[PDB]
C-alpha cells in the first residue's frame, strides 16, 4: 500500500 | 573528498527585453551539500529567491536550482554568486543571454 520504502540501519 | 560546484546562469524562456521571465542559477556537481547561492541584480542581492529540494545525480553529486521572476532590459546586469567549502572566495557568474 505505502509508496515509500522502509529503510534499515547500516 | 570534496567536489566544487558547476554553475550555470540562464533564463527559463528566451530573453526578450521588457518581457517577464525567470532567472535561474543551476548549481551542480558539488559535495558536500552546504552551499550559499545568491542571485544579483546590478550587483545587489535579490530577495525571496526560491530553490528546489536538495537532490543528487547517480554519481552522488548534489544539485539545486535557484530561481526568481525578472523582466530583462538592455541596461540591467544579472548574476549568480556561489559560495562552497571548496571555494576560497565567492564565485560570480554573469548572466549572458547567449549561454
Amino acid at each position: 500500500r505505502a509508496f515509500v520504502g522502509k529503510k534499515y540501519c547500516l | 573528498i570534496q567536489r566544487t560546484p558547476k554553475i550555470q546562469v540562464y533564463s527559463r524562456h528566451p530573453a526578450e527585453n521588457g518581457k517577464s521571465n525567470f532567472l535561474n542559477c543551476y548549481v551542480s556537481g558539488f559535495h558536500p551539500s552546504d552551499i550559499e547561492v545568491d542571485l544579483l541584480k546590478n550587483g545587489e542581492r535579490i530577495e525571496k529567491v526560491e530553490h528546489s529540494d536538495l537532490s543528487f545525480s547517480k554519481d552522488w553529486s548534489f544539485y539545486l536550482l535557484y530561481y526568481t521572476e525578472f523582466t530583462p532590459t538592455e541596461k540591467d546586469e544579472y548574476a549568480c554568486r556561489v559560495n562552497h567549502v571548496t571555494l576560497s572566495q565567492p564565485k560570480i557568474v554573469k548572466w549572458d543571454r547567449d549561454m
Binding site: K6 | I1, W60
Partner: protein, 264 residues
C-alpha cells in the same frame, strides 16, 4: 518508453546544531512527486497520507542510527559533519515489467554498499561496509528490499504512470537553433541549442565533414528550465568561412526523427 521510480535520500550530521537533517525526494523519471524534509515546518510537500508520513519519520530515525554506526566504523570523531546518501527504486519497460531494482548507499560521497542486480546479495566497498553486509545478511534484509522493489514499487509506478499519462508519458521534443559568434577575424563559435524538452535524456553532438568532434565540443550539463523541461547546448570553434562543414545532430524521444541542423 521505459520509466523509473527513484528516491534520493540525504542525511547530514551537524554537531552542535541538532540532530542530522533528513531529506527524501521521490521521482518518476525527471518529475518530482514527493518530498520529506525533517527540517520543514511542514514536513512533506506534494505537487494513507498518514502511513507514508510515518515511514518517512521512521526513515529519519533509521538514517540517524546509520550515521552513528558509520562514524564508529571509521573511528571518526564526534566533531565533524558527515553525509549518508541513498538511492532506491525500480525501473520498468514499456509494458510495465520490471527491468531492475536498486538499493544503494554512499558515505561522504563514496560508494559504500549496494544491493546487487539479483536482489539477493550485497557488494560492500570496504571493511566497514562488510559489517553492514554481515548485519543485513543476518537479518535477511535483502529479502525485504526485494519484496518492495518487485511488488509495491512496480505497482505504484504503473498506477502513477497511468493516472499521470498526459504528462508522465508525454515526451516533449527539443526546440532547436544554431547561433554564430565571431571570436576573432579567424574563428567563430557555433552553438547548437536544445530547449523545452522532456525527459532530460538527450544527445547533442557536432560533426565536421561527418566526423564526430567529441574532443573539440564544449557540452554543458543538461539543465532544468523550471517549467518541467530541460535545456542543453553544444559549442564548437570553427575557422571563418568553414561553417557549412559542421552539422549539429539531435536525438530525443519526443522527435519523430533525429535532427540535422546547420548554421542558418
Amino acid at each position: 518508453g521505459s520509466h523509473s521510480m527513484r528516491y534520493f535520500d540525504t542525511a547530514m550530521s551537524r554537531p552542535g546544531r541538532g540532530e542530522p537533517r533528513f531529506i527524501s525526494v521521490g521521482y518518476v523519471d525527471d518529475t518530482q512527486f514527493v518530498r520529506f524534509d525533517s527540517d520543514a515546518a511542514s514536513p512533506r510537500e506534494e505537487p494513507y497520507w498518514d502511513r507514508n508520513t510515518q515511514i518517512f519519520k521512521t526513515n529519519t530515525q533509521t538514517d540517524r542510527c546509520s550515521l552513528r554506526n558509520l562514524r564508529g566504523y571509521y573511528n571518526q570523531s564526534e566533531a565533524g559533519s558527515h553525509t549518508l546518501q541513498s538511492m532506491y527504486g525500480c525501473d520498468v519497460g514499456p509494458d510495465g515489467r520490471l527491468l531492475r531494482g536498486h538499493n544503494q548507499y554512499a558515505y561522504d560521497g563514496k560508494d559504500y554498499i549496494a544491493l546487487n542486480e539479483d536482489l539477493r546479495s550485497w557488494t560492500a566497498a570496504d571493511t566497514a561496509a562488510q559489517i553492514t553486509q554481515r548485519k543485513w545478511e543476518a537479518a535477511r534484509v535483502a529479502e525485504q528490499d526485494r519484496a518492495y522493489l518487485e511488488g509495491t514499487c512496480v505497482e505504484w509506478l504503473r498506477r502513477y504512470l497511468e493516472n499521470g499519462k498526459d504528462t508522465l508519458e508525454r515526451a516533449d521534443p527539443p526546440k532547436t537553433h544554431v547561433t554564430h559568434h565571431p571570436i576573432s577575424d579567424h574563428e567563430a563559435t557555433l552553438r547548437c541549442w536544445a530547449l523545452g524538452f522532456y525527459p532530460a535524456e538527450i544527445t547533442l553532438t557536432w560533426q565536421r565533414d561527418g566526423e564526430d568532434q567529441t574532443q573539440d565540443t564544449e557540452l554543458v550539463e543538461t539543465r532544468p528550465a523550471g517549467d518541467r523541461t530541460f535545456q542543453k547546448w553544444a559549442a564548437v570553434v570553427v575557422p571563418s568561412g568553414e561553417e557549412q562543414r559542421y552539422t549539429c545532430h539531435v536525438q530525443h524521444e519526443g522527435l519523430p526523427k533525429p535532427l540535422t541542423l546547420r548554421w542558418e
